[PDB]
Write an enzyme that holds these catalytic residues in place. Structure first.
Site, PDB file in Angstrom:
ATOM      1  N   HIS A   7      -7.876  -5.438   0.957  1.00  0.00           N
ATOM      2  CA  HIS A   7      -6.601  -4.746   0.994  1.00  0.00           C
ATOM      3  C   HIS A   7      -5.817  -5.062   2.276  1.00  0.00           C
ATOM      4  O   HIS A   7      -6.321  -4.902   3.387  1.00  0.00           O
ATOM      5  CB  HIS A   7      -6.875  -3.247   0.906  1.00  0.00           C
ATOM      6  CG  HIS A   7      -5.680  -2.427   0.549  1.00  0.00           C
ATOM      7  ND1 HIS A   7      -5.038  -2.539  -0.664  1.00  0.00           N
ATOM      8  CD2 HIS A   7      -5.018  -1.471   1.240  1.00  0.00           C
ATOM      9  CE1 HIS A   7      -4.027  -1.690  -0.704  1.00  0.00           C
ATOM     10  NE2 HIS A   7      -4.000  -1.025   0.437  1.00  0.00           N
TER      11      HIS A   7
ATOM     12  N   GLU B 298      -9.477  -5.243  -3.916  1.00  0.00           N
ATOM     13  CA  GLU B 298      -8.732  -4.080  -3.449  1.00  0.00           C
ATOM     14  C   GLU B 298      -9.607  -3.006  -2.820  1.00  0.00           C
ATOM     15  O   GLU B 298      -9.171  -2.287  -1.918  1.00  0.00           O
ATOM     16  CB  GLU B 298      -7.910  -3.487  -4.600  1.00  0.00           C
ATOM     17  CG  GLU B 298      -6.722  -4.345  -5.013  1.00  0.00           C
ATOM     18  CD  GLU B 298      -5.596  -4.294  -3.974  1.00  0.00           C
ATOM     19  OE1 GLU B 298      -5.713  -3.514  -3.001  1.00  0.00           O
ATOM     20  OE2 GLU B 298      -4.591  -5.027  -4.120  1.00  0.00           O
TER      21      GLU B 298
ATOM     22  N   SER C  86       0.826  -1.208   0.000  1.00  0.00           N
ATOM     23  CA  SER C  86       0.000   0.000   0.000  1.00  0.00           C
ATOM     24  C   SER C  86       0.864   1.264   0.000  1.00  0.00           C
ATOM     25  O   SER C  86       1.688   1.447  -0.890  1.00  0.00           O
ATOM     26  CB  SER C  86      -0.955  -0.021   1.193  1.00  0.00           C
ATOM     27  OG  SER C  86      -2.103   0.769   0.950  1.00  0.00           O
TER      28      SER C  86
HETATM   29  C1  LIG Z   1      -4.311   3.145   1.552  1.00  0.00           C
HETATM   30  O1  LIG Z   1      -4.332   1.960   2.333  1.00  0.00           O
HETATM   31  C2  LIG Z   1      -4.589   2.023   3.674  1.00  0.00           C
HETATM   32  C3  LIG Z   1      -5.049   3.183   4.294  1.00  0.00           C
HETATM   33  C4  LIG Z   1      -5.313   3.244   5.675  1.00  0.00           C
HETATM   34  C5  LIG Z   1      -5.129   2.158   6.534  1.00  0.00           C
HETATM   35  C6  LIG Z   1      -4.652   0.892   5.936  1.00  0.00           C
HETATM   36  C7  LIG Z   1      -4.377   0.834   4.516  1.00  0.00           C
HETATM   37  O2  LIG Z   1      -3.958  -0.411   4.172  1.00  0.00           O
HETATM   38  C8  LIG Z   1      -4.179  -1.307   5.279  1.00  0.00           C
HETATM   39  C9  LIG Z   1      -3.061  -2.342   5.338  1.00  0.00           C
HETATM   40  C10 LIG Z   1      -1.730  -1.677   5.663  1.00  0.00           C
HETATM   41  O3  LIG Z   1      -1.282  -0.915   4.532  1.00  0.00           O
HETATM   42  C11 LIG Z   1      -1.875  -0.815   6.906  1.00  0.00           C
HETATM   43  C12 LIG Z   1      -3.040  -0.286   7.304  1.00  0.00           C
HETATM   44  C13 LIG Z   1      -4.352  -0.433   6.552  1.00  0.00           C
HETATM   45  C14 LIG Z   1      -5.497  -0.910   7.460  1.00  0.00           C
HETATM   46  C15 LIG Z   1      -5.687  -0.040   8.698  1.00  0.00           C
HETATM   47  N1  LIG Z   1      -6.390   1.226   8.418  1.00  0.00           N
HETATM   48  C16 LIG Z   1      -7.047   1.694   9.649  1.00  0.00           C
HETATM   49  C17 LIG Z   1      -5.432   2.269   8.009  1.00  0.00           C
END
Ligand SMILES: COc1ccc2c3c1O[C@H]1C[C@@H](O)C=C[C@@]31CCN(C)C2
Ligand SMILES: *[C@@H]1O[C@H](CO[C@@H]2O[C@@H](C)[C@@H](O)[C@@H](O)[C@@H]2O)[C@@H](O[C@@H]2O[C@H](CO)[C@@H](O)[C@H](O)[C@H]2NC(C)=O)[C@H](O)[C@H]1NC(C)=O
Ligand SMILES: *[C@@H]1O[C@H](CO[C@@H]2O[C@@H](C)[C@@H](O)[C@@H](O)[C@@H]2O)[C@@H](O[C@@H]2O[C@H](CO)[C@@H](O)[C@H](O)[C@H]2NC(C)=O)[C@H](O)[C@H]1NC(C)=O
Ligand SMILES: COc1ccc2c3c1O[C@H]1C[C@@H](O)C=C[C@@]31CCN(C)C2
Ligand SMILES: *[C@@H]1O[C@H](CO)[C@@H](O)[C@H](O)[C@H]1NC(C)=O
Lengths: 535, 530
Positions: free
Chosen positions: A442, A329, A200
């Site tokens: 995701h 995703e 990410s």
């Molecule tokens: C743009 O992707 C994200 C945007 C915010 C967050 C996450 C994301 O991807 C998820 C997996 C990892 O990357 C970390 C946190 C995530 C899951 C936890 N949330 C609360 C925050």
């Protein structure tokens, strides 16, 4: 005193810890300082290298999590808590971690460097899911991960100013990579074989190091999981960054709007960290999903141009890259704002809710642009079927933010000299607590790449353990040789190319080769839509 | 002397002719004058009712074809010659034809009125493929077809002017419909049951009569085959009509609208025909120079507007398309196309083809077309590029205008039946890759396969008979269906049901190219307005 747990790096002496793993011992050096603490006057500034120290620093546990917003949407829910900080928040957070085999390798060993995600506003290298012990044990590599500043502390920018230049979070990452070059050999690691990987926002960071020459000399290969530097969420322009910085300052009483940058930043520097964090979400221009307030800024420095331009106009010969996405995703992001959505019901939305969701999922585009999205994601034989609408909004959000940015990157790198490998991760973990309709959301391949299913205290199936070992092997093969394939009768993972566009499914079944990363959808996002936005 | 072939209409007395069919005789009255010859000072003017005559008009043969361009792309080829004039050209061409059962019906018989197509620049009621004898014998209707002015003669318009007001070919059609109201009973026809049917520009014509109140009371049901009044080719705006009329004048050596029209009136008809093609603003397929004009009179607004704002309760329509609407037009100007090879084009040709098939739109609009019609897994495959460009031309010009008409009419009170005609005639001379081209359902609707001297299979004969039955059922009742035994359901905006017409029994399907027509009917207009 145990010789294996003692190491000297350029800055002074370190003492580590010995970790038990299902397959044998690993040496861990956790919480190594790599920068001076970005405290007080050093808030928003580029990281300064850690001054050398006398005596022995105990690198025996993860250090503090950088200040960040803590998710409370589903309190106590495993799906949220697994990403939340597992150490106290502090601005004093610039520490990295090294895991090495026990005993320490005799010949130079390839290095994996992990960069966590979290939308550029959260995350930490200390999370259970990023535990490097299993990878290091299974595949005998050295694993390094670092903390880097997130949110305003890492990415608030008043472009031009010396006092808040922006991108310091990326500079934190760079400093760690420099540290790896200077010091990883002391742990048995090979500074000439360094593979970055991230997911990410971490994947987008990796891509930015690819596109920034001073970073590019510090590693040799790259892995981008569910993220790309060219995603519409991962960077912001100079003026929009200034607008957001200034709005935050205004929200917390600075100055007593705009003015002298030096003075405005000085006033921000007097605000308690938590105060900035509490107002962070309030600076975004419109209501949205997959948009974050403080992210890397395109200011001509770290990034000389937009990542899209740099990708399009770059020579990538001699580079190997592994890239991929999960099956669903977009689903995770819908339960964080889109009308009609919840992890606790079926989220079977109506047509009106779908259309409303399109504006949330594709924020700040013209009505015409929105109409184009509705056209390409509506099934006109079933325009109002709730289940189809739910799946479609998920695809809209997922394609726009992740799949299509990754596909453009993969396609352009391939066409311009890079050997590229692409995957789609299709296994839904037996332990997943999100509802079935979200599919494989995701972030949920990470636990498999890190070999978390081997953790005896966890309840993964035996097949999932076999799968985790398979994945770690691909990743490490890629790290070692630039090719995930085994150095027999086992099915081959072919390179991704702009024409054939081949990728593999990763799940419990063997490799299956397929064509096109949402090709029809991504032609819309990557080829047509940008032309529409210009006109 | 056969009294069955003697008829007296308002203007005077007629002598018809007995025609043979494999099912028995039929009465035909061919070449009945319904207007004063629109010649000399009358060129470009609305039609005047034919003045009464003394004696007996010989109505035993087809009359002259209205002046029009003659297709010579493939000289002697059947696929071109069957559409070309089969009588001498003349401006004295306003005649109509009546076919009736023999002996003449002694009670009110339902009337089918045929309006031929030809891109508004060609066509004739005398063509073999429009022979009414088989329909009338088999289904016992009365069949009327008329000639109407085409090309500049029917559609040259200097809007606002009295000397060339435009739409006169449409008024030729209306006058014939009026003639039918007044005289068809004298043949056994029932003026209270008149069904209009037409194909392509003929279908566009029918739709325009639907949307023009002075015509709407001259008929009761409508059939639109492979055409619609809202087709991007079927109408032109006042401004562009004036520009084209002006360009024609210049090309033939003429200079005030009065002076311009007067000079045009001095030119031999053939001379106007010779320069007709050369007034179009760009290289194109499926565009024609002189077509009906939206000037507030015949059409008070664009057909699209009139369609969206209409109350169509009380109306039954039968609409449909052939399987491959676009293919035929590609060999008339699309780069890399021929009837004599596989037309396996390159992507470059496909891209050039798009600007030709979708002329006069922004580069952005064209890009959107290219996006929709490209398979991005196979962007360069010649066979797919050929099919796709055929789809572009056919969806844009025919399928999607027809889908929109059907959808709006159904949603606004009309009962609509829709079909796709998917039978490739055993006798078809166009190459296999063209599939079932524009125009090639007509011979089946008219029951031409029943003609012994032609080479249709016994299956095709049965099929033609099925089709004649559907069409005539529709004319009689507003519903094509036979007594229950598979049923043809009405088309609706939501369920979007239509049937396939071929040698197999009716099969019900959903969506007239719904994904593609969403693009042309919903998205593309918005884009063009920005
Ligand atoms: C743009 O992707 C994200 C945007 C915010 C967050 C996450 C994301 O991807 C998820 C997996 C990892 O990357 C970390 C946190 C995530 C899951 C936890 N949330 C609360 C925050
Ligand atoms: C599915 O859930 C959403 C989210 O609402 C929350 O979660 C549910 C499990 C339930 O506990 C709700 O009471 C929660 O508020 C529902 O959308 C909400 O609808 C209510 C009014 O009905 C409204 O006040 C909220 O603003 C809505 N939230 C959002 C984001 O739209 C949705 O209706 C549920 N779908 C169902 C029940 O079919
Ligand atoms: C298929 O034919 C087209 C049309 O060309 C005509 O028909 C052919 C059968 C042959 O008789 C040609 O000589 C005719 O001109 C071909 O397209 C043409 O290509 C020529 C060069 O050979 C070019 O000068 C013309 O401009 C082209 N005409 C058009 C309509 O664009 C085409 O090459 C053939 N495609 C194949 C071989 O599959
Ligand atoms: C817009 O449709 C058309 C435009 C022009 C022409 C025809 C069309 O449809 C065909 C079938 C029928 O309607 C009459 C003529 C056609 C075939 C003969 N060509 C030469 C002229
Ligand atoms: C802003 O204010 C500070 C505080 O005294 C001053 O030193 C600095 O020069 C000012 N900067 C500008 C650009 O005006």
């Amino acid at each position: 005193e145990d010789a294996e747990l003692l190491v000297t790096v350029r800055g002074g002496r370190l003492r580590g810890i010995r970790l038990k793993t299902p397959g044998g011992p690993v040496s861990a050096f956790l919480g190594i300082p790599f920068a001076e603490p970005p405290m007080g006057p050093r808030r928003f500034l580029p990281p300064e290298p850690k001054q050398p120290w006398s005596g022995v620093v105990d690198a025996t546990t993860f250090q503090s999590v950088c200040y960040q917003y803590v998710d409370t949407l589903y309190p106590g829910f495993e799906g949220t808590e697994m990403w939340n900080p597992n150490r106290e928040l502090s601005e004093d957070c610039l520490y990295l971690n090294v895991w090495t085999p026990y005993p320490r390798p005799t010949s130079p060993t390839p290095v994996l460097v992990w960069i966590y995600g979290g939308g550029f506003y959260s995350g930490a290298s200390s999370l259970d899911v990023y535990d490097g012990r299993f990878l290091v044990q299974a595949e005998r590599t050295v694993l390094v991960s670092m903390n880097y500043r997130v949110g305003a502390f890492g990415f608030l920018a008043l472009p031009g100013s010396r006092e808040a230049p922006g991108n310091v979070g990326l500079l934190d990452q760079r400093l760690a990579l420099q540290w790896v070059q200077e010091n990883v050999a002391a742990f048995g690691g090979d500074p000439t074989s360094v593979t970055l990987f991230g997911e990410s926002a971490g994947a987008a960071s990796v891509g930015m190091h690819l596109l920034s020459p001073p970073s590019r000399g510090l590693f040799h290969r790259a892995v981008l999981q569910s993220g790309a530097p060219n995603g519409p969420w991962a960077t912001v322009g100079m003026g929009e960054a200034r607008r957001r910085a200034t709005q935050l300052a205004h929200l917390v009483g600075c100055p007593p709007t705009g003015g002298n940058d030096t003075e405005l930043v000085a006033c921000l520097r007097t605000r308690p960290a938590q105060v900035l964090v509490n107002h962070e979400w309030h600076v975004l221009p419109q209501e949205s999903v997959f948009r974050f307030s403080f992210v890397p800024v395109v200011d001509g420095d770290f990034l000389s141009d937009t990542p899209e331009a740099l990708i399009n106009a770059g020579d990538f010969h001699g580079l190997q890259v592994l890239v991929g996405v999960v099956k669903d995703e977009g689903s995770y992001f819908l339960v964080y704002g889109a009308p009609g959505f919840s992890k606790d019901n079926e989220s079977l939305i109506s047509r009106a809710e779908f259309l409303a969701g399109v504006r949330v999922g594709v924020p700040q585009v013209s009505d015409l642009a929105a109409e184009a999205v509705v056209l390409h994601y509506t099934d006109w034989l079933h325009p109002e079927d709730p289940a189809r609408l739910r799946e479609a909004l998920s695809d809209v959000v997922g394609d726009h933010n992740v799949v299509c940015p990754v596909a453009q990157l993969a396609g352009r790198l391939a066409a311009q000299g890079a050997r590229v490998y692409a995957y789609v991760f299709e296994h839904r973990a037996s332990t997943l607590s999100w509802p079935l309709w979200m599919g494989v959301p995701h972030g949920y391949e990470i636990e498999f790449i890190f070999g978390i299913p081997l953790d005896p205290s966890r309840n993964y199936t035996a097949e999932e353990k076999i799968f985790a070992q398979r994945l770690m092997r691909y990743w490490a093969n890629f790290a070692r040789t630039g090719d995930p394939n085994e150095p027999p009768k086992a099915p081959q993972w072919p390179p991704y190319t702009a024409g054939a566009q081949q990728y593999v499914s990763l799940d419990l079944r063997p490799l299956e080769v397929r064509r096109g990363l949402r090709a029809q959808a991504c032609a819309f996002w990557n080829r047509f839509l940008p032309k529409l936005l210009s006109a």
